[PDB]
């Protein structure tokens, strides 16, 4: 038993684990409970969010469980990770409006509603309670400043000033992990490179609060185009997984006009084909580039997936 | 948490449980490990085997696990359940040949190969070992004759004589359940009406051997045609889920020419639609019978499933 660890590292989806061996272990023994999340900083996800939520499927595939968290709380604050400009808060309706969009997509990418499947959580439930005096007593006590001033994320901000709220974000997200680690049994936190800091911060506080209850962190990598030009950025800014911002036809194309270099890879990253199917599909590429098979299947795979069987047609029938 | 128990009894898939409440319970608490099996008495399954193995999916759907057992051992003996004529043994090649067929179908109906998914077991592994003196000591001791002479199955046989082997079958199958109950954690045994006796017999010996380690038995019902004529029996004897004995076109038809009375039901029994989709699909039936929607979708559902997306086409394109 250890095939899942096998394809996630063939397909190259492993940027870093906190404790390699430890993760390798429980994955080949117990049925883990890994989760991922996103704040409602928009009313639609974008292909940058496609990789991480798929890796959650990869896991679910072999008996494991995935938990999808929507930032109904940490959303209103926003994650300075990466950013090198302070954010700007947003209207209670704005957030509570956005989550209606993001939730409509997840619900389609994953299967919510079972007796023991994935779960959709919103942190405004546990962060919506906890008070000012409280937060300071119960959590702040064992969350030292030298540590926070250590998070890579923060410096870009420390450099041209980081407001206190951007600064008290990591503690908001640590509280989360812990809550799930103690509430749904969560032990692994999957997320992009931009989440190393927050992930780790979650386990560091899990240890202080009570000798780290078997928690670990996994990071999916950074999808890199071949030419060195921003995966996910069209003139039409991003490439939105929302039909009416980025359509199946526009969607379709994006994957079929995708370069041959960064092609098989993307096949591994976003398709549920096997090493065989790809092997062959890598072949058609390597010697009969005219039929343009790679670029084609990829497309029709991710499109039927994201957008539909029929809309795939509709898209193709417009091609 | 209790939706699965909800649709299995809406769709009517529950003929009987050994301990109703007890099953209701662990199903709304822990992720069960239910299994089902079939002896290689042929090299292809038939629609009579479609219901039970689907109900295993129903379960797997909500976090649970299914184990598919092939009778590589109890096969060579054959289950007198139902039968009212002694069986006839069969060639070691014959069995070892048949299982190649039956396994090719399961592998397509279920997903074998994961870190923690369903598992394919063959009992010739645990029954292939156990010796004559042994079997008598370790198992026979606490397997009283008055009990066996109680199994409904047996009397039909007791009436026109039951050979000892048909008689020592139930103990072969009890040993199984137990082995899985102690080996893979199995707690529920799903199978058709014709398996009540064997199922129960498995838990009765599990208790004697050691206070029944939390085992229960579930039975799917008997698919009944509307007219009262043998579901699954064509002139072409059965309706084989093997392409080259019962083809997608022949397959296709069988479901589209299926009567309107026993139609929505069969929709519930064999399709993964919702109560909604069916509601509507029950409607089209009830007032626009000309479009013949029920009979149609059913077909194309079960066909794409059993035989393929493309072969569905091929079938339709021959319709
Ligand atoms: N603080 C997190 C959100 C979070 C919310 C609650 C938690 O308890 C832990 C983290 C974040 O910044 N997420 C990105 C987002 O937009 O929501 C998102 C990124 O955009 C990403 O590319 C795909 O979602 C990858 O970094 C994974 N991420 O969660
Ligand atoms: N003794 C069982 C097989 C068995 C094998 C190993 C076990 O440890 C327990 C039982 C039997 O008779 N099965 C049917 C078959 O043909 O294999 C089969 C029936 O045909 C059925 O209709 C669908 O498979 C339903 O009764 C479920 N059944 O298992």
Ramachandran class of A290: left when φ > 0, alpha when ψ lies in -120 to 50, beta otherwise: alpha
Beta strands A65-70 and B119-122, pairing class: unpaired
| β A65-70/B16-17 pair status | unpaired
**CB A271, CB A298: distance < 8 Å:** yes
Residues of B in contact with A63 (CB under 8 A): 65, 114-117
Cα B179-B182-B186 angle, rounded to 5 deg: 90
Give yes or no for a contact between A32 and A65, defined as CB atoms under 8 angstroms apart: yes
Rounded alpha-carbon distances, angstroms, from residue A214 to A1, A56, A206: 20, 19, 9
For A166-197, b where at least 16 C-beta lie within 10 A, e where not — what string?
A: bbebbbbbbbbbbbbbeeeebbbbbbbebbbb
Which structural domains are found in chain B, ordered by start? 2-222 (3.40.50.620), 223-318 (1.10.240.10)
User: Which of B106, B167, B172, B194 gets mutated to test ligand 2 (max ligand atoms within 8 A of its CB)?
Assistant: B194
Q: Please give the resolution of this entry in Å, rounded to 1 decimal.
A: 3.2
Indicate which atom in ligand 2 lies nearest the CA of residue B40.
17
- Of A28, A61, A114, which is closest to B114 when you measure between CB atoms? A61
Q: What are phi and psi of A252, to 5 degrees?
A: -40, -65
Contacts of residue B194, Cβ cutoff 8 Å, sequence gap at least 6 = B79, B81, B82, B153
Cα(first)–Cα(last) distance of chain A, in Å?
44
Of B1, B63, B116, the CB nearest to A62: B116
Token code pair at residue B155: 């009397």
Give me A24's structure tokens.
Answer: 């390798």
Interface test with B, best of A33, A67, A116, A274 (most B CBs within 10 A): A116
How far is Cα A303 from Cα B133, in angstroms, rounded to an integer? 62
CB under 8 A, 24+ apart: contacts of B245-249: B245/B44, B246/B46, B247/B315, B248/B303, B248/B307, B248/B308, B248/B311, B248/B312, B248/B314, B248/B315, B249/B314, B249/B315, B249/B318, B249/B319
Q: Which residue has the tokens 């014959």?
A: B94
Shortest Cα distance, chain A CAs vs residue B224, angstroms: 29
> Which of A7, A66, A115 to mutate to test binding with chain B, by most B CBs within 10 Å of its CB?
A115
Three-state helix/strand/coil letters over chain A: CCCHHHHHCCCCCCCEECCHHHHHHHHCCCCCEEEEEECCCCCCCEHHHHHHHHHHHHHHHCCCEEEEEECCCCCCCCCCCCCCCCCCCCCHHHHHHHHHHHHHHHHHHCCCCCCCCCEEEEHHHCCCCCCHHHHHHHHHHHCCHHHHCCCHHHHHHHHCCCCHHHHCCHHHHHHHHHHHHHHCCCCEEEECHHHHHHHHHHHHHHHHHCCCCCCEEEECCCCCCCCCCCCCCCCCCCCECCCCCCCHHHHHHHHHCCCCCCCHHHHHHHCCCCHHHHHHHHHHHHHCCCCCHHHHHHHHHHHHHHHCCHHHHHHHCCC
A310 contacts on B by Cβ (under 8 Å):
none
**Atom 10, ligand 2: residue with shortest CA distance:** B37
State phi, psi for A217 to the nearest 5 degrees: -125, 135
Nearest ligand for residue A121 CA: 1
Ligand nearest to the CA of B232: 2
Out of A1, A113, A115, name the one closest to residue B115 (CB): A1
- Cα–Cα separations (whole angstroms), residue A6 to A13, A217, B83: 11, 18, 48
A108 lines ligand 1 (CB under 6 A): no
Query: Do the Cβ atoms of A63 and B114 come within 8 Å?
Result: yes
Which pair of structure tokens corresponds to residue A241?
């997984």
Phi and psi at A75, nearest 5°, equal: -70, -55
CA of A192 to the centre of ligand 1 (A): 7
Does the Cβ of B79 fall within 6 Å of ligand 2?
Answer: yes
Smallest Cβ–Cβ distance between B115 and the set A2, A114, A116 belongs to: A2
Q: Which residues of A34-54 are buried (b: 16+ CB within 10 A; e: fewer)?
A: bbbbbbbbbbbbbbbbbbbbb
d(CA A209, CA A207): 6
A151 lines ligand 1 (CB under 6 A): no
Looking at CA atoms only, how far is residue A111 from chain B in angstroms?
10
Residue B222 CA to ligand 2 center (angstroms) comes to 13
B69 strand-pairing partners: B37, B121
Give the span between the Cα atoms of B10 and B62, in whole angstroms: 16
Q: Cβ(B202) to ligand 2 under 6 A?
A: no
HSE-up of B279 (CA within 13 Å, CB side)? 4
* CA-based torsion, A284, A285, A287, A291: positive or negative: positive
Position of tokens 């009283």? B144
Cβ distance B62 to A28 less than 8 Å, yes or no, reads no
Bridge partners (DSSP) of residue B46 are: B240
- How close does chain A come to B63, measured CA to CA in Å? 5
Which residue in chain A is spatially nearest to B118 when comparing CA positions? Answer: A63
d(CA B154, CA B170): 10
- The answer, yes or no, to whether any atom of ligand 2 lies below 6 A from the CB of B40, is no
Q: Evaluate: CB of A60 within 6 angstroms of ligand 1.
A: no
- CA distances to A101, A164, A241, A271, A305 from A104, rounded to whole Å, are 5, 33, 11, 22, 14
Look-up of token digits 């994006």: A254
Give φ, ψ of A190 to 5 degrees: -105, 135
- d(CA B269, nearest CA chain A) in Å: 19
Task: Give the residues across from B38 on adjacent strands.
Answer: B70
The pair of three-digit structure tokens given for residue B181, joined into one six-digit string: 């109950």
* CA distance linking residue A116 with residue B118, whole number of Å: 16
A234 alpha-carbon distance from chain centroid: 21
**Contact assessment for residue B143 and residue B173, using Cβ atoms and an 8 Å cutoff:** no
User: Rounded to whole angstroms, how far apart are CA atoms B151 and A232?
Assistant: 66
CB contact under 8 A, B114 and A62: yes
Give the 3-state secondary structure of chain B.
Answer: CCCHHHHHCCCCCCCEECCHHHHHHHHCCCCCEEEEEECCCCCCCEHHHHHHHHHHHHHHHCCCEEEEEECCCCCCCCCCCCCCCCCCCCCHHHHHHHHHHHHHHHHHHCCCCCCCCCEEEEHHHCCCCCCHHHHHHHHHHHCCHHHHCCCHHHHHHHHCCCCHHHHCCHHHHHHHHHHHHHHCCCCEEEECHHHHHHHHHHHHHHHHHCCCCCCEEEECCCCCCCCCCCCCCCCCCCCECCCCCCCHHHHHHHHHCCCCCCCHHHHHHHCCCCHHHHHHHHHHHHHCCCCCHHHHHHHHHHHHHHHCCHHHHHHHCCC
What is the rounded distance in angstroms from the CA atom of residue A225 to the CA atom of residue A301?
A: 19
HEC string of B161-217 equals CCCHHHHCCHHHHHHHHHHHHHHCCCCEEEECHHHHHHHHHHHHHHHHHCCCCCCEE
Q: Is the CB of B246 under 6 A from ligand 2?
A: no
What is the rounded distance in angstroms from the CA atom of residue A70 to the CA atom of residue A106? 10
Tell me chain B's radius of gyration from C-alpha atoms.
20
Task: Decide if A101 contacts A242 (C-beta within 8 A).
Answer: yes
**Which of A4, A114, A116 lies closest to B115 in CB terms?**
A4
Assess whether the C-beta atom of B44 lies below 6 angstroms from ligand 2: no
Contacts across the A-B interface (CB distance below 8 Å): 47
Q: A296 and A252 in contact (C-beta within 8 Å)?
A: no
Is A316 in contact with A301 (CB distance < 8 Å)?
no
Cα(A174) to centroid of ligand 1, in Å?
13
- Answer for the pair B251, B306: CB distance below 8 angstroms, yes or no: yes
Ligand 1 lined by A27 (C-beta under 6 Å): no
């Amino acid at each position: 038993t250890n095939v899942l660890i096998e394809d996630l590292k063939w397909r190259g989806l492993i940027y870093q684990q906190t404790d390699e061996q430890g993760i390798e272990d429980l994955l080949n023994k117990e049925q883990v409970t890994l989760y991922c999340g996103a704040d409602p900083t928009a009313d639609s996800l974008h292909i940058g969010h496609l990789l991480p939520f798929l890796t959650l499927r990869r896991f679910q595939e072999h008996g494991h469980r995935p938990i999808v968290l929507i930032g109904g709380g940490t959303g209103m604050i926003g994650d300075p990770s990466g950013k090198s400009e302070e954010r700007v808060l947003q209207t209670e309706e704005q957030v509570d409006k956005n989550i209606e969009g993001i939730s409509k997509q997840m619900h389609n990418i994953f299967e919510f509603g079972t007796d023991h499947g994935a779960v959709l959580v919103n942190n405004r439930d546990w962060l919506g309670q906890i008070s000012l005096i409280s937060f300071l007593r119960d959590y702040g006590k064992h969350v030292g400043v030298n540590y926070m001033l250590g998070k890579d994320s923060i410096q870009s901000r420390l450099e041209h000033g980081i407001s206190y709220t951007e600064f008290t974000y990591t503690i908001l997200q640590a509280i989360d992990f812990g809550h799930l680690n103690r509430e749904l049994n969560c032990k692994i936190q999957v997320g992009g490179s931009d989440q190393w800091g927050n992930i780790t911060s979650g386990i560091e506080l899990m240890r202080r609060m009570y000798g780290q209850t078997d928690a670990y962190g996994l990071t999916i990598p950074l999808v890199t185009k071949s030419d060195g030009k921003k995966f996910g950025k069209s003139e039409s800014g991003a490439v939105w997984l929302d039909a009416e911002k980025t359509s199946p036809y526009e969607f379709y194309q994006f994957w079929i006009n995708q370069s041959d270099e960064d092609v098989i890879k993307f096949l591994k990253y976003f398709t549920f084909l096997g090493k065989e199917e790809i092997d062959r599909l890598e072949q058609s590429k390597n010697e009969a580039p005219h039929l343009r098979e790679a670029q084609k299947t990829l497309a029709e795979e991710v499109t039927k997936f994201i957008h539909g069987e029929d809309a795939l047609n509709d898209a193709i029938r417009i091609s």
